[PDB]
Amino acid sequence: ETLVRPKPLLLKLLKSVGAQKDTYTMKEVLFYLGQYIMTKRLYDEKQQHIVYCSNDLLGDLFGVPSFSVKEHRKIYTMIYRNLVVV
Numbered sequence: 001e002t003l004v005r006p007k008p009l010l011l012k013l014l015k016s017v018g019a020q021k022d023t024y025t026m027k028e029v030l031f032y033l034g035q036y037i038m039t040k041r042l043y044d045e046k047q048q049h050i051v052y053c054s055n056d057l058l059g060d061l062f063g064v065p066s067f068s069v070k071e072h073r074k075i076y077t078m079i080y081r082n083l084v085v086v
């Protein structure tokens with residue numbers, strides 16, 4: 001029950017999947033992020049652990065063109081840089 005407040009771009013991403021609160025648990029942020037990736041089918045249909053996020057809000061957010069869902073350290077860093085732990 002780490003509570004977080006997302007930065008503007010991450011809030012836009014969360015609201016695009018129906019999450020309109022301003023404060024979240026980290027678990028909620030990760031959940032919505034995964035729902036965003038799935039709905040927009042940003043993962044590679046043949047290599048489904050690879051997310052291509054160039055030219056998308058998620059890439060603008062993360063500042064990378066792609067990442068593997070298995071890269072937890074990198075993903076947590078990119079998420080942390082886009083919110084404030086309160």
Ligand SMILES: *CC(=O)Nc1ccc(NC(=O)C*)cc1
Nearest residue numbers: 048049068069070071072073
């Ligand atoms: C179904 C599936 O792929 N589950 C899964 C569980 C855990 C992890 N990684 C870690 O817990 C670090 C990957 C995939």
Ligand SMILES: [Cl-]
Nearest residue numbers: 007008009010
């Ligand atoms: Cl932002």
